[PDB]
Amino acid sequence: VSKANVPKIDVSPLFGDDQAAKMRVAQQIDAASRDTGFFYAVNHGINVQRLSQKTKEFHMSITPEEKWDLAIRAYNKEHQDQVRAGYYLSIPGKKAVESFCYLNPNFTPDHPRIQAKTPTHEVNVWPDETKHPGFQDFAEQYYWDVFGLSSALLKGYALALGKEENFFARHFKPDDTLASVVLIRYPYLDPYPEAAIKTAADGTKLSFEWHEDVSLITVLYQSNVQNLQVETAAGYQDIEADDTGYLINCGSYMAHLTNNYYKAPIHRVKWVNAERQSLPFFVNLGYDSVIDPFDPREPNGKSDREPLSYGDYLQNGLVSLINKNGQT
Ligand SMILES: CC1(C)S[C@@H]2[C@H](NC(=O)CCC[C@H](N)C(=O)O)C(=O)N2[C@H]1C(=O)O
Ligand SMILES: [Fe+2]
C-alpha cells in the first residue's frame, strides 16, 4: 500500500493581517485540495492535549445508565427529538464504536429555529454535572475554539479560489451554524467482534466503509494510530497519523459549489485493534444558507449546477449516509 502525500500547512498567517502571507497559505490549500484532498493544519493554537484528556475521562467513566439517558432515538424510542445530538451506543459483541455528538450551544428553547421545530436543529443533551464535573464547560468552549480555527481555514479556501476572504465565512455564524462535534471512541477489544469488521473488495479489513463527508469542510483531530485511507485512481493510499495537527478535507457541499474543482475525497477507515479517538468537527453553514455554484476553470466562472440550500443538503445527506454505511 502506498502512502498519501499529505502536506503540513502552517495556518497561522490566516489569523493575522499580512495579506501576501495569507496568499501563500492559500496556494498550499489549493495544491492539496487538487491532489489527494487532505492536508494537516499546524500552528493552529488549540490545546489538543487537553481535548484528548478530557474526552478520554468522559468515555471511560460513563455508565450504561447514563448512556440510555443520553441516547439518540435509534437506541431509545423515548427520545423522539434526538436524531443528531446525544449518545450513539456500542453493542457488546457486535458494534465496537461509540460516540457522543453535540451541536451549536446557542440552540436553546428560546432559539427561533427550535421554536419553529426546523429539521436538523436540536437542543444538546448533557450528562449530570456532578458525575462529569467540568465536561459540559470544556465541550462548549472547545466548540468555539474549533469554530475559530474553521473560520480562519474558510478564509484560506476563499482566497485559494480567487474570492474575497469572507466568501464562505460570511455564512458561518455562531447564531445559526449547523456544525457538529462528534467524540468517537474506537476501543481495544480482545477478542474483537467479527461482526464489527468489514472486508473491502480489495481484501482490506475495515471499520467504516468508503464515503464522502456531508460537510463544507471537516476539521479532524485523531490520536496517533494510523487508520485512514484515501481513494485515488491507482487505489487506496494510507494517510499518516499526527496527533498534534488537524486533518482537513472538503465535504460534498464544497464539490457542489465548485463544479467538482475541489472534490470531496472518498476515504475509509481501516480496522486496527487499538484504543483510540476520532474527534471530527463538521463545518456546516446555516439552514437557509445558499452559495451560487461557480466553475473556477472558466473565465466567466459560470456553472450549470443548481443552487442548493444548506439545510436541504444536510437533511438529505445525513439520511443517505446512514442508509449507505449503517447506523453509527
Ligand atoms: C471517518 C470519520 C472521521 S467521519 C465518519 C462518520 N461520520 C458520520 O457518521 C457523520 C456524523 C454526523 C453527526 N451525527 C451530525 O449530525 O452532524 C463517523 O463517525 N466517522 C469518523 C470515523 O469513523 O473516524
Ligand atoms: Fe469521513
d(Cα 243, Cα 127) in Å, to the nearest integer?
27
Cβ neighbours for 50, distance < 8 A, ≥ 6 positions apart:
138
Q: Which residue CA neighbors atom 3 of ligand 1 most closely?
A: 280
Question: Which of 44, 79, 171, 267 is flagged as catalytic?
Answer: 267
Select from 180, 208, 219, 230 the residue to mutate for testing ligand 1; criterion: most ligand atoms less than 8 Å from CB. 208
DSSP letters spanning 148-161: HHHHHHHHHHHHHT
Question: Which of 132, 213, 282, 294 is flagged as catalytic?
Answer: 213
Ligand 1 nearest-atom number relative to CA 83: 16
Cell numbers 467524540 correspond to 183
Q: CB-based burial of residue 107 (10 Å sphere; 0-12 exposed, 13-18 middle, 19+ buried)?
A: buried
Bridge partners for 39 per DSSP: 248
- State whether the beta carbon of 182 lies less than 6 angstroms from ligand 1: yes
Is 50 one of the annotated binding-site residues? Answer: no
- State in Å: Cα 18 to ligand 1 middle: 35
- State whether the beta carbon of 281 lies less than 6 angstroms from ligand 1: no
Q: Which three cell numbers stand for residue 83?
A: 436524531
Cβ neighbours for 46, distance < 8 A, ≥ 6 positions apart:
145, 146, 149, 246
> Among 175, 193, 205, 182, which residue's Cα sits nearest to residue 321?
182
Is the Cβ–Cβ distance between 212 and 181 less than 8 Å? no
Residue ranges of the domains in the chain? Answer: 1-328
Task: Mark the residues whose beta carbon lies below 5 A from ion ligand 2.
Answer: 213
Is 73 one of the annotated binding-site residues? Answer: no
| Three-state secondary-structure class, residue 137 | helix
d(Cα 251, Cα 263) in Å, to the nearest integer?
8
- State whether the beta carbon of 315 lies less than 6 angstroms from ligand 1: no
Distance of alpha carbon 294 from the chain centroid:
24
d(Cα 281, Cα 48) in Å, to the nearest integer?
13
Cβ neighbours for 267, distance < 8 A, ≥ 6 positions apart:
210, 211, 228, 229, 230, 231, 239, 249
Cβ neighbours for 34, distance < 8 A, ≥ 6 positions apart:
261, 262
- State in Å: Cα 318 to ligand 1 middle: 10
d(Cα 242, Cα 221) in Å, to the nearest integer?
9
Is the Cβ–Cβ distance between 186 and 97 less than 8 Å? yes
Question: Would you call 58 a catalytic residue per the annotation?
Answer: no
Is 59 one of the annotated binding-site residues? Answer: no
Whole-Å CA distances, 248 to 7, 52, 222, 259, 293: 11, 18, 11, 20, 22
Strands 246-250 and 198-199: unpaired
Is 171 one of the annotated binding-site residues? Answer: no
Select from 180, 278, 287, 318 the residue to mutate for testing ligand 1; criterion: most ligand atoms less than 8 Å from CB. 278
